[PDB]
Design a protein around this ligand. Structure first.
Ligand SMILES: [Hg+2]
Ligand SMILES: [Hg+2]
Ligand SMILES: [Hg+2]
Ligand SMILES: [Hg+2]
Ligand SMILES: [Hg+2]
Ligand SMILES: [Zn+2]
Length: 260
Protein backbone atom coordinates (compact mmCIF):
# COMPACT_ATOMS: atom_id res chain seq x y z
CA UNK A 1 0.00 0.00 0.00
CA UNK A 2 1.26 3.59 0.25
CA UNK A 3 1.09 2.97 -3.51
CA UNK A 4 2.89 5.42 -5.69
CA UNK A 5 2.80 3.54 -8.93
CA UNK A 6 1.04 5.27 -11.85
CA UNK A 7 1.91 5.61 -15.51
CA UNK A 8 3.98 8.85 -15.24
CA UNK A 9 7.61 9.27 -16.22
CA UNK A 10 8.52 8.87 -12.51
CA UNK A 11 6.24 6.09 -11.20
CA UNK A 12 5.48 4.42 -14.56
CA UNK A 13 5.87 0.97 -16.05
CA UNK A 14 9.73 1.23 -16.24
CA UNK A 15 10.01 2.01 -12.50
CA UNK A 16 7.60 -0.61 -11.05
CA UNK A 17 10.34 -3.20 -10.47
CA UNK A 18 11.94 -0.83 -7.93
CA UNK A 19 8.91 -1.68 -5.74
CA UNK A 20 7.42 -4.76 -7.43
CA UNK A 21 10.36 -6.99 -8.38
CA UNK A 22 7.88 -9.49 -9.88
CA UNK A 23 7.56 -6.88 -12.61
CA UNK A 24 10.58 -8.71 -14.14
CA UNK A 25 9.05 -12.21 -13.65
CA UNK A 26 8.76 -14.93 -16.26
CA UNK A 27 4.96 -14.76 -16.60
CA UNK A 28 4.32 -11.03 -17.06
CA UNK A 29 1.50 -9.54 -19.11
CA UNK A 30 0.67 -8.18 -21.62
CA UNK A 31 2.58 -9.84 -24.48
CA UNK A 32 2.80 -9.66 -28.25
CA UNK A 33 0.83 -12.34 -30.07
CA UNK A 34 2.73 -13.81 -33.01
CA UNK A 35 0.16 -15.68 -35.06
CA UNK A 36 2.92 -17.49 -36.90
CA UNK A 37 3.98 -18.98 -33.54
CA UNK A 38 0.66 -19.77 -31.84
CA UNK A 39 -0.22 -23.45 -31.29
CA UNK A 40 -3.57 -25.05 -32.11
CA UNK A 41 -4.85 -26.93 -29.06
CA UNK A 42 -7.78 -29.21 -29.97
CA UNK A 43 -8.89 -29.72 -26.34
CA UNK A 44 -9.98 -26.07 -26.01
CA UNK A 45 -13.73 -25.92 -25.58
CA UNK A 46 -15.92 -23.03 -26.62
CA UNK A 47 -15.96 -20.33 -24.01
CA UNK A 48 -19.41 -19.86 -22.44
CA UNK A 49 -20.36 -16.74 -20.42
CA UNK A 50 -23.57 -16.51 -18.39
CA UNK A 51 -24.03 -13.21 -16.68
CA UNK A 52 -27.01 -11.93 -14.67
CA UNK A 53 -27.55 -8.19 -15.29
CA UNK A 54 -29.05 -7.98 -11.81
CA UNK A 55 -25.55 -8.58 -10.44
CA UNK A 56 -24.12 -5.29 -11.80
CA UNK A 57 -23.72 -2.95 -8.83
CA UNK A 58 -21.40 0.11 -9.07
CA UNK A 59 -18.93 2.16 -11.14
CA UNK A 60 -15.98 3.83 -9.36
CA UNK A 61 -13.02 6.09 -10.19
CA UNK A 62 -9.89 4.36 -8.91
CA UNK A 63 -7.54 7.21 -9.87
CA UNK A 64 -5.55 5.37 -12.58
CA UNK A 65 -8.82 4.13 -14.18
CA UNK A 66 -12.54 3.33 -13.61
CA UNK A 67 -14.12 -0.06 -12.69
CA UNK A 68 -17.63 -1.50 -13.08
CA UNK A 69 -18.08 -3.85 -10.07
CA UNK A 70 -20.30 -6.86 -9.85
CA UNK A 71 -21.84 -8.68 -6.88
CA UNK A 72 -19.71 -11.85 -6.45
CA UNK A 73 -21.49 -13.68 -3.58
CA UNK A 74 -23.06 -16.20 -5.94
CA UNK A 75 -22.35 -18.09 -9.11
CA UNK A 76 -25.13 -16.09 -10.76
CA UNK A 77 -22.63 -14.66 -13.32
CA UNK A 78 -19.92 -17.03 -14.57
CA UNK A 79 -17.63 -18.08 -17.36
CA UNK A 80 -16.87 -21.69 -18.28
CA UNK A 81 -15.25 -23.75 -21.00
CA UNK A 82 -12.31 -22.49 -23.05
CA UNK A 83 -9.38 -24.10 -21.17
CA UNK A 84 -11.08 -24.44 -17.82
CA UNK A 85 -12.41 -27.37 -15.91
CA UNK A 86 -14.15 -25.17 -13.30
CA UNK A 87 -16.35 -22.07 -13.26
CA UNK A 88 -15.07 -18.50 -12.70
CA UNK A 89 -17.21 -15.81 -11.04
CA UNK A 90 -17.43 -12.34 -12.68
CA UNK A 91 -16.37 -9.47 -10.46
CA UNK A 92 -15.50 -6.59 -12.83
CA UNK A 93 -14.88 -5.03 -16.27
CA UNK A 94 -12.58 -2.02 -17.09
CA UNK A 95 -10.63 -0.45 -19.99
CA UNK A 96 -7.11 0.49 -21.00
CA UNK A 97 -6.31 3.37 -23.42
CA UNK A 98 -3.46 5.62 -24.59
CA UNK A 99 -2.86 9.33 -25.01
CA UNK A 100 -3.36 8.95 -28.75
CA UNK A 101 -6.43 7.26 -30.23
CA UNK A 102 -4.35 4.92 -32.41
CA UNK A 103 -1.96 3.36 -29.90
CA UNK A 104 -3.49 2.45 -26.55
CA UNK A 105 -4.05 -1.33 -26.20
CA UNK A 106 -2.08 -3.55 -23.81
CA UNK A 107 -1.79 -6.78 -25.86
CA UNK A 108 -0.44 -6.45 -29.42
CA UNK A 109 -1.03 -8.79 -32.40
CA UNK A 110 1.83 -9.37 -34.85
CA UNK A 111 3.46 -6.29 -33.31
CA UNK A 112 0.46 -4.06 -34.01
CA UNK A 113 -0.96 -1.95 -31.16
CA UNK A 114 -4.72 -1.35 -31.22
CA UNK A 115 -6.49 1.79 -29.89
CA UNK A 116 -7.81 0.42 -26.54
CA UNK A 117 -8.68 -2.79 -24.65
CA UNK A 118 -11.65 -4.08 -22.63
CA UNK A 119 -10.81 -6.47 -19.70
CA UNK A 120 -13.61 -8.61 -18.11
CA UNK A 121 -12.12 -10.32 -15.01
CA UNK A 122 -13.23 -13.33 -13.08
CA UNK A 123 -12.02 -15.40 -10.11
CA UNK A 124 -11.94 -19.13 -9.30
CA UNK A 125 -14.89 -19.72 -6.92
CA UNK A 126 -14.46 -23.47 -7.39
CA UNK A 127 -10.99 -23.44 -5.73
CA UNK A 128 -10.76 -20.37 -3.44
CA UNK A 129 -12.98 -18.74 -0.79
CA UNK A 130 -12.66 -15.15 -2.02
CA UNK A 131 -11.15 -12.95 -4.70
CA UNK A 132 -8.44 -11.84 -2.26
CA UNK A 133 -7.04 -15.37 -1.80
CA UNK A 134 -7.24 -16.32 -5.45
CA UNK A 135 -5.69 -13.10 -6.74
CA UNK A 136 -2.23 -14.39 -5.95
CA UNK A 137 -2.67 -18.05 -6.96
CA UNK A 138 -1.68 -19.38 -10.44
CA UNK A 139 -5.25 -20.48 -11.41
CA UNK A 140 -6.83 -17.69 -9.43
CA UNK A 141 -8.12 -15.32 -12.09
CA UNK A 142 -9.33 -15.46 -15.67
CA UNK A 143 -9.55 -12.29 -17.75
CA UNK A 144 -11.20 -11.87 -21.16
CA UNK A 145 -9.38 -9.27 -23.31
CA UNK A 146 -10.94 -7.58 -26.36
CA UNK A 147 -8.93 -5.28 -28.59
CA UNK A 148 -10.67 -2.03 -29.61
CA UNK A 149 -10.03 -0.50 -33.05
CA UNK A 150 -10.68 3.21 -33.69
CA UNK A 151 -13.43 3.74 -36.23
CA UNK A 152 -17.20 3.96 -36.12
CA UNK A 153 -18.87 4.83 -32.79
CA UNK A 154 -19.85 1.84 -30.65
CA UNK A 155 -23.46 2.23 -29.51
CA UNK A 156 -23.10 -0.60 -26.99
CA UNK A 157 -20.78 1.57 -24.82
CA UNK A 158 -23.32 4.35 -24.22
CA UNK A 159 -24.57 3.25 -20.76
CA UNK A 160 -20.92 3.11 -19.54
CA UNK A 161 -20.12 6.60 -20.91
CA UNK A 162 -23.33 8.27 -19.64
CA UNK A 163 -22.36 6.93 -16.24
CA UNK A 164 -18.94 8.63 -16.20
CA UNK A 165 -20.45 12.06 -15.51
CA UNK A 166 -21.06 10.90 -11.91
CA UNK A 167 -17.51 9.62 -11.21
CA UNK A 168 -15.40 12.48 -12.59
CA UNK A 169 -12.96 12.45 -9.65
CA UNK A 170 -10.95 9.91 -7.68
CA UNK A 171 -12.94 7.88 -5.26
CA UNK A 172 -16.40 8.87 -6.45
CA UNK A 173 -18.78 5.90 -6.85
CA UNK A 174 -22.30 5.44 -8.30
CA UNK A 175 -24.92 2.68 -8.54
CA UNK A 176 -24.60 0.97 -12.00
CA UNK A 177 -27.25 -1.70 -12.46
CA UNK A 178 -29.07 -4.10 -14.72
CA UNK A 179 -26.28 -4.64 -17.23
CA UNK A 180 -24.79 -7.64 -19.01
CA UNK A 181 -21.18 -7.17 -20.06
CA UNK A 182 -21.54 -9.96 -22.67
CA UNK A 183 -23.27 -7.30 -24.85
CA UNK A 184 -19.72 -5.87 -25.21
CA UNK A 185 -18.08 -8.97 -26.61
CA UNK A 186 -17.68 -9.53 -30.37
CA UNK A 187 -19.79 -12.20 -32.18
CA UNK A 188 -16.92 -14.71 -32.64
CA UNK A 189 -16.08 -17.51 -30.22
CA UNK A 190 -12.42 -17.93 -31.41
CA UNK A 191 -9.56 -16.90 -29.12
CA UNK A 192 -5.92 -17.11 -28.03
CA UNK A 193 -4.97 -18.11 -24.43
CA UNK A 194 -1.77 -17.96 -22.34
CA UNK A 195 -0.78 -17.87 -18.65
CA UNK A 196 0.19 -14.38 -17.48
CA UNK A 197 -0.43 -11.73 -14.89
CA UNK A 198 -2.17 -8.62 -13.80
CA UNK A 199 -0.95 -5.78 -16.08
CA UNK A 200 -0.46 -3.49 -13.11
CA UNK A 201 0.67 -3.61 -9.52
CA UNK A 202 0.64 -5.84 -7.59
CA UNK A 203 1.38 -7.70 -10.87
CA UNK A 204 0.58 -11.24 -9.57
CA UNK A 205 1.15 -14.14 -12.01
CA UNK A 206 -2.36 -15.37 -11.44
CA UNK A 207 -4.18 -14.87 -14.69
CA UNK A 208 -5.12 -17.18 -17.45
CA UNK A 209 -5.80 -14.75 -20.33
CA UNK A 210 -8.43 -15.15 -23.03
CA UNK A 211 -7.78 -12.83 -26.07
CA UNK A 212 -10.72 -12.66 -28.48
CA UNK A 213 -9.75 -13.09 -32.10
CA UNK A 214 -12.18 -10.35 -33.27
CA UNK A 215 -11.82 -6.69 -32.22
CA UNK A 216 -14.71 -4.27 -31.55
CA UNK A 217 -14.95 -0.61 -32.68
CA UNK A 218 -14.85 2.65 -30.68
CA UNK A 219 -14.67 6.26 -32.00
CA UNK A 220 -12.25 9.03 -31.12
CA UNK A 221 -14.90 11.00 -29.22
CA UNK A 222 -15.71 7.89 -27.22
CA UNK A 223 -12.06 7.57 -26.22
CA UNK A 224 -11.82 11.25 -25.47
CA UNK A 225 -14.53 10.71 -22.82
CA UNK A 226 -12.32 8.13 -21.11
CA UNK A 227 -9.42 10.53 -21.20
CA UNK A 228 -11.54 13.32 -19.64
CA UNK A 229 -11.97 11.65 -16.21
CA UNK A 230 -9.52 12.93 -13.56
CA UNK A 231 -7.14 11.25 -11.11
CA UNK A 232 -7.24 13.96 -8.42
CA UNK A 233 -9.80 14.13 -5.63
CA UNK A 234 -12.64 16.70 -5.97
CA UNK A 235 -11.50 20.24 -5.12
CA UNK A 236 -7.91 19.81 -6.32
CA UNK A 237 -6.30 20.94 -9.60
CA UNK A 238 -7.44 18.80 -12.64
CA UNK A 239 -5.14 15.90 -13.64
CA UNK A 240 -6.53 13.93 -16.59
CA UNK A 241 -6.31 10.12 -16.81
CA UNK A 242 -4.32 10.44 -20.07
CA UNK A 243 -3.15 6.86 -20.33
CA UNK A 244 -3.03 3.55 -18.43
CA UNK A 245 -1.48 0.97 -20.78
CA UNK A 246 1.60 -1.06 -19.93
CA UNK A 247 4.27 -2.11 -22.40
CA UNK A 248 4.31 -5.71 -23.74
CA UNK A 249 6.64 -8.08 -21.93
CA UNK A 250 8.94 -10.95 -22.89
CA UNK A 251 7.30 -14.37 -23.32
CA UNK A 252 10.21 -16.18 -21.63
CA UNK A 253 9.07 -19.29 -23.37
CA UNK A 254 5.38 -19.42 -22.69
CA UNK A 255 3.10 -20.78 -25.42
CA UNK A 256 0.14 -18.88 -26.93
CA UNK A 257 -2.55 -21.43 -27.72
CA UNK A 258 -5.34 -20.82 -30.22
CA UNK A 259 -8.84 -22.28 -30.46
CA UNK A 260 -8.50 -22.40 -34.25
HG1 LIG B 1 -10.13 -8.82 -29.50
HG1 LIG C 1 -21.16 -12.14 -27.60
HG1 LIG D 1 -16.55 -15.95 -26.76
HG1 LIG E 1 -13.91 -13.92 -26.97
HG1 LIG F 1 -13.89 -14.39 -28.46
ZN1 LIG G 1 -6.89 -4.46 -17.18
Amino acid sequence: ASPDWGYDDKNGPEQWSKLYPIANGNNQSPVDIKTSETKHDTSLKPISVSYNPATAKEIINVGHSFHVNFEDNDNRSVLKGGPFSDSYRLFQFHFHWGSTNEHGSEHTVDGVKYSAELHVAHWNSAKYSSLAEAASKADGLAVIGVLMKVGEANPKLQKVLDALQAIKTKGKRAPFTNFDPSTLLPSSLDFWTYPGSLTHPPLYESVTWIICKESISVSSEQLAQFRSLLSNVEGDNAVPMQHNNRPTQPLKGRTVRASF
